[PDB]
Amino acid sequence: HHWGYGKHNGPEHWHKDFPIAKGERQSPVDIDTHTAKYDPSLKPLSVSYDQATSLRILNNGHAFNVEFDDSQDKAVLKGGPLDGTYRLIQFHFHWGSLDGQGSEHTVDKKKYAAELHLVHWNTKYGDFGKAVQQPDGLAVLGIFLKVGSAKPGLQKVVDVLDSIKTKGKSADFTNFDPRGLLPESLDYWTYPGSLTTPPLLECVTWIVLKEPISVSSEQVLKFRKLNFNGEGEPEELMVDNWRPAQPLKNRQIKASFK
Numbered sequence: 001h002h003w004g005y006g007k008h009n010g011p012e013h014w015h016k017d018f019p020i021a022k023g024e025r026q027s028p029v030d031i032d033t034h035t036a037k038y039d040p041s042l043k044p045l046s047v048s049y050d051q052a053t054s055l056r057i058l059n060n061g062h063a064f065n066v067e068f069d070d071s072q073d074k075a076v077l078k079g080g081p082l083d084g085t086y087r088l089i090q091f092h093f094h095w096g097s098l099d100g101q102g103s104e105h106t107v108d109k110k111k112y113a114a115e116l117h118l119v120h121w122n123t124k125y126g127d128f129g130k131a132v133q134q135p136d137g138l139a140v141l142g143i144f145l146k147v148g149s150a151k152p153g154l155q156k157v158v159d160v161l162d163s164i165k166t167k168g169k170s171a172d173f174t175n176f177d178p179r180g181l182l183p184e185s186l187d188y189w190t191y192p193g194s195l196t197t198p199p200l201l202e203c204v205t206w207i208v209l210k211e212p213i214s215v216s217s218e219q220v221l222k223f224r225k226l227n228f229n230g231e232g233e234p235e236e237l238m239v240d241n242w243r244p245a246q247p248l249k250n251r252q253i254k255a256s257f258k
């Protein structure tokens with residue numbers, strides 16, 4: 001009886017094995033745009049992905065992760081609210097059964113069809129496992145997806161998904177350029193939070209871009225053909241793998257833009 005995205009093991013149950021689920025810095029949150037304060041001290045984000053080395057794509061039973069070589073400073077996030085250098089380790093998405101839900105963060109209670117998380121760890125802690133134990137260990141760049149025009153830079157991802165349909169399946173996934181998943185603007189909101197899946201550790205500086213990317217209906221339909229289950233097991237479509245918004249508590253959401 002492991003955690004997941006069902007009625008009997010979904011987000012409202014997670015606290016039983018992971019009590020931090022009820023903590024003071026949980027993610028995601030609703031971003032209330034009128035109250036988020038413009039902070040002129042925030043810097044432009046520096047996204048430096050020119051040397052990114054993707055390696056593999058994995059269906060982990062909860063999402064699919066595109067994994068990177070993080071053994072050197074190649075694909076790094078700097079600037080913005082961050083001190084120091086954060087290396088890209090993986091990206092994944094959360095998405096819905098329908099276009100009207102799927103994102104983790106919400107904007108004035110609006111849910112997007114999906115949300116991309118580019119996960120980075122602070123090099124001062126040496127490895128990801130050490131970084132998740134620190135309040136400034138991770139930086140997750142969150143990007144909303146809306147359904148409209150296709151995103152050309154997502155299609156390579158879409159087209160490999162049939163080969164990793166079920167939990168535990170992986171495939172080669174070299175030479176993928178994550179710059180193709182960004183929007184035009186790097187304007188963002190930021191706040192201190194957590195991982196949005198167990199173990200729910202409170203180690204994340206969240207950076208959520210304001211501008212969504214557009215993907216096609218056909219692209220997101222292919223996400224929804226993935227399975228939570230393993231091969232040969234009863235098919236459970238991998239949909240609605242999002243945690244809903246958690247209480248903000250006293251936390252300030254800051255905007256990089258006026």
Ligand SMILES: N=C(N)NC(=N)NCCc1ccc(S(N)(=O)=O)cc1
Pocket residue numbers: 058065066067068069070071072089090091128
């Ligand atoms: N830097 C190193 N030499 N070593 C290292 N362990 N690198 C991280 C490799 C890794 C692990 C898990 C994921 S996943 N499946 O969680 O996305 C993505 C990438």
Ligand SMILES: N=C(N)NC(=N)NCCc1ccc(S(N)(=O)=O)cc1
Pocket residue numbers: 060062065117119140194195196197198199
């Ligand atoms: N648990 C697994 N099977 N795999 C995994 N690679 N998770 C690693 C830890 C993690 C990273 C980013 C987020 S988030 N959703 O906050 O960006 C949540 C959790």
Ligand SMILES: [Zn+2]
Pocket residue numbers: 092093094117196
């Ligand atoms: Zn995520």
